[PDB]
Amino acid sequence: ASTDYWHFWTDGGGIVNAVNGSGGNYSVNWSNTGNFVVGKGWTTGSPFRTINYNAGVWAPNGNGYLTLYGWTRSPLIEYYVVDSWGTYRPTGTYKGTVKSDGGTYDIYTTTRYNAPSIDGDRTTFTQYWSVRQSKRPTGSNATITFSNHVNAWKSHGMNLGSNWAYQVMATEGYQSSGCSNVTVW
């Protein structure tokens, strides 16, 4: 089904202006920020979901990610499928690659310690990353077949939690400014 969840979070640094638009459309306009995540998607994430989006505006000036973003519990996992970015390409511990939706993605893990999560501010958890080897073109309808990433991650020994939290097509930024506009379905 279509999106049912609006995600807006900022660490308080700088200015993050977001619009919860009609349907699955949203926009972000940010300046000299700390860390923030804004997106639309689903209250309950699914490993079988194919996420559709169209990024009509993708204009980070500095570190911003255009990314599928979500969490699981049992175990606690923060996951990313990064289609585009700004000045910084996110990486971690290299695992391998996956080909999905016309792109090749590098697979990474990063375990974080005494770190903020949906479960507290000093928790331990692993990030699962799929990061496109080159920036995906924006402005046309795009698909993220999330089951391909779940499958490849599992093949590399990266198991997701059994309890699913939110799952969104997000704009994340850190120490940056920028203009963004995305429709998700």
GROMACS .gro file of C-alpha atoms in nm:
model
  185
    1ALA     CA    1   0.000   0.000   0.000
    2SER     CA    2   0.087   0.372  -0.010
    3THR     CA    3   0.282   0.558   0.262
    4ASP     CA    4   0.132   0.591   0.611
    5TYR     CA    5   0.418   0.745   0.811
    6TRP     CA    6   0.587   1.085   0.837
    7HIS     CA    7   0.937   1.101   0.985
    8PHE     CA    8   1.090   1.430   1.102
    9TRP     CA    9   1.391   1.432   1.334
   10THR     CA   10   1.665   1.688   1.400
   11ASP     CA   11   1.937   1.698   1.668
   12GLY     CA   12   1.860   2.071   1.706
   13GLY     CA   13   2.161   2.195   1.508
   14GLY     CA   14   2.091   2.456   1.239
   15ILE     CA   15   1.759   2.490   1.058
   16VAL     CA   16   1.555   2.206   0.906
   17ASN     CA   17   1.234   2.308   0.729
   18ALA     CA   18   1.017   2.020   0.609
   19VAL     CA   19   0.680   1.994   0.438
   20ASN     CA   20   0.451   1.698   0.493
   21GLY     CA   21   0.281   1.732   0.153
   22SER     CA   22  -0.013   1.554  -0.010
   23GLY     CA   23   0.016   1.183  -0.086
   24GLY     CA   24   0.371   1.057  -0.044
   25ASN     CA   25   0.529   1.393  -0.132
   26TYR     CA   26   0.757   1.583   0.103
   27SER     CA   27   1.024   1.852   0.083
   28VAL     CA   28   1.322   1.965   0.290
   29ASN     CA   29   1.508   2.294   0.302
   30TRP     CA   30   1.798   2.296   0.547
   31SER     CA   31   2.084   2.527   0.651
   32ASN     CA   32   2.411   2.469   0.839
   33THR     CA   33   2.268   2.172   1.029
   34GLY     CA   34   2.377   1.909   1.275
   35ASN     CA   35   2.231   1.564   1.201
   36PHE     CA   36   1.872   1.526   1.079
   37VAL     CA   37   1.652   1.270   0.902
   38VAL     CA   38   1.329   1.353   0.717
   39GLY     CA   39   1.121   1.111   0.512
   40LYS     CA   40   0.795   0.942   0.424
   41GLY     CA   41   0.723   0.573   0.432
   42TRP     CA   42   0.566   0.311   0.655
   43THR     CA   43   0.516   0.271   1.031
   44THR     CA   44   0.595  -0.100   0.997
   45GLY     CA   45   0.885  -0.189   0.767
   46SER     CA   46   0.876  -0.499   0.549
   47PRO     CA   47   1.150  -0.711   0.390
   48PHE     CA   48   0.917  -0.774   0.093
   49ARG     CA   49   0.847  -0.409   0.011
   50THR     CA   50   0.947  -0.252  -0.319
   51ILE     CA   51   0.978   0.121  -0.253
   52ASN     CA   52   0.897   0.361  -0.535
   53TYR     CA   53   1.013   0.721  -0.538
   54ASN     CA   54   1.077   1.024  -0.754
   55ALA     CA   55   1.321   1.288  -0.631
   56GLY     CA   56   1.214   1.602  -0.819
   57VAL     CA   57   1.478   1.801  -0.632
   58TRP     CA   58   1.804   1.657  -0.502
   59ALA     CA   59   2.035   1.943  -0.408
   60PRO     CA   60   2.254   1.887  -0.102
   61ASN     CA   61   2.532   2.141  -0.051
   62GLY     CA   62   2.759   1.927   0.165
   63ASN     CA   63   2.682   1.596   0.333
   64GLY     CA   64   2.331   1.476   0.250
   65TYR     CA   65   2.199   1.126   0.166
   66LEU     CA   66   1.903   1.029  -0.049
   67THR     CA   67   1.839   0.692   0.106
   68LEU     CA   68   1.601   0.422   0.214
   69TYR     CA   69   1.628   0.426   0.593
   70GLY     CA   70   1.483   0.211   0.871
   71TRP     CA   71   1.523   0.003   1.186
   72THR     CA   72   1.462  -0.344   1.324
   73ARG     CA   73   1.468  -0.476   1.680
   74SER     CA   74   1.581  -0.823   1.798
   75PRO     CA   75   1.853  -0.756   1.704
   76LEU     CA   76   1.870  -0.377   1.685
   77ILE     CA   77   1.977  -0.276   1.333
   78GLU     CA   78   1.985   0.059   1.151
   79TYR     CA   79   1.981   0.009   0.773
   80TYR     CA   80   2.041   0.218   0.460
   81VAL     CA   81   1.999   0.186   0.084
   82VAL     CA   82   2.178   0.498  -0.041
   83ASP     CA   83   2.094   0.598  -0.400
   84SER     CA   84   2.255   0.943  -0.399
   85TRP     CA   85   2.459   1.177  -0.180
   86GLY     CA   86   2.638   1.513  -0.171
   87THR     CA   87   3.004   1.569  -0.089
   88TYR     CA   88   3.047   1.252   0.118
   89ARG     CA   89   2.999   0.890   0.011
   90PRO     CA   90   2.914   0.684   0.320
   91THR     CA   91   3.118   0.366   0.369
   92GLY     CA   92   3.190   0.110   0.640
   93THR     CA   93   3.345  -0.235   0.663
   94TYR     CA   94   3.334  -0.375   0.309
   95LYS     CA   95   3.133  -0.695   0.263
   96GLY     CA   96   3.066  -0.727  -0.111
   97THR     CA   97   2.825  -0.602  -0.377
   98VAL     CA   98   2.463  -0.638  -0.490
   99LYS     CA   99   2.305  -0.556  -0.827
  100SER     CA  100   1.951  -0.422  -0.794
  101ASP     CA  101   1.726  -0.180  -0.983
  102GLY     CA  102   1.986  -0.106  -1.253
  103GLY     CA  103   2.258  -0.015  -1.004
  104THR     CA  104   2.550  -0.187  -0.834
  105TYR     CA  105   2.572  -0.127  -0.458
  106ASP     CA  106   2.863  -0.180  -0.221
  107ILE     CA  107   2.760  -0.356   0.100
  108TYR     CA  108   2.901  -0.236   0.434
  109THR     CA  109   2.859  -0.292   0.807
  110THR     CA  110   2.939  -0.051   1.089
  111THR     CA  111   2.881  -0.140   1.452
  112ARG     CA  112   2.820   0.159   1.677
  113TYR     CA  113   2.886   0.169   2.052
  114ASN     CA  114   2.737   0.393   2.324
  115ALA     CA  115   2.536   0.550   2.043
  116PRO     CA  116   2.185   0.695   2.004
  117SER     CA  117   1.916   0.468   1.860
  118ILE     CA  118   1.539   0.411   1.873
  119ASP     CA  119   1.617   0.217   2.195
  120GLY     CA  120   1.817   0.483   2.383
  121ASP     CA  121   2.104   0.730   2.367
  122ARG     CA  122   2.390   0.495   2.469
  123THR     CA  123   2.314   0.173   2.282
  124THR     CA  124   2.511  -0.076   2.071
  125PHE     CA  125   2.386  -0.172   1.723
  126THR     CA  126   2.505  -0.247   1.370
  127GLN     CA  127   2.437  -0.040   1.060
  128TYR     CA  128   2.375  -0.231   0.738
  129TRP     CA  129   2.462  -0.023   0.431
  130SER     CA  130   2.396  -0.066   0.063
  131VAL     CA  131   2.559   0.229  -0.114
  132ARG     CA  132   2.535   0.278  -0.490
  133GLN     CA  133   2.878   0.278  -0.657
  134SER     CA  134   2.783   0.597  -0.842
  135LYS     CA  135   2.506   0.851  -0.773
  136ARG     CA  136   2.169   0.743  -0.913
  137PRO     CA  137   2.013   0.990  -1.158
  138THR     CA  138   1.717   1.175  -1.002
  139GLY     CA  139   1.393   1.322  -1.140
  140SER     CA  140   1.236   1.008  -1.286
  141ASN     CA  141   1.046   0.725  -1.118
  142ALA     CA  142   1.287   0.497  -0.934
  143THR     CA  143   1.249   0.164  -0.759
  144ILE     CA  144   1.427   0.015  -0.460
  145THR     CA  145   1.352  -0.358  -0.449
  146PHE     CA  146   1.437  -0.391  -0.081
  147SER     CA  147   1.410  -0.771  -0.086
  148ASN     CA  148   1.722  -0.782  -0.308
  149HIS     CA  149   1.917  -0.597  -0.039
  150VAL     CA  150   1.772  -0.810   0.245
  151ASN     CA  151   1.870  -1.119   0.043
  152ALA     CA  152   2.226  -1.006  -0.035
  153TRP     CA  153   2.284  -0.887   0.322
  154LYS     CA  154   2.168  -1.226   0.455
  155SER     CA  155   2.408  -1.400   0.212
  156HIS     CA  156   2.691  -1.194   0.365
  157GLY     CA  157   2.591  -1.295   0.720
  158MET     CA  158   2.394  -0.976   0.788
  159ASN     CA  159   2.069  -1.078   0.957
  160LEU     CA  160   1.795  -0.824   1.024
  161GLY     CA  161   1.582  -0.817   1.337
  162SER     CA  162   1.246  -0.993   1.351
  163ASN     CA  163   1.064  -0.685   1.484
  164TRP     CA  164   1.021  -0.409   1.226
  165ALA     CA  165   1.013  -0.039   1.310
  166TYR     CA  166   0.964   0.245   1.058
  167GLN     CA  167   1.090   0.234   0.698
  168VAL     CA  168   1.117   0.555   0.496
  169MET     CA  169   1.264   0.705   0.181
  170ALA     CA  170   1.464   0.976   0.355
  171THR     CA  171   1.679   1.284   0.324
  172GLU     CA  172   1.957   1.270   0.584
  173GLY     CA  173   2.208   1.550   0.636
  174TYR     CA  174   2.504   1.641   0.852
  175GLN     CA  175   2.695   1.971   0.866
  176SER     CA  176   2.528   2.090   0.547
  177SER     CA  177   2.270   2.305   0.374
  178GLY     CA  178   2.039   2.208   0.091
  179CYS     CA  179   1.717   2.193  -0.105
  180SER     CA  180   1.521   1.851  -0.154
  181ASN     CA  181   1.181   1.722  -0.282
  182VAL     CA  182   1.070   1.358  -0.296
  183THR     CA  183   0.750   1.161  -0.362
  184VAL     CA  184   0.728   0.809  -0.217
  185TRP     CA  185   0.482   0.525  -0.288
   0.00000   0.00000   0.00000
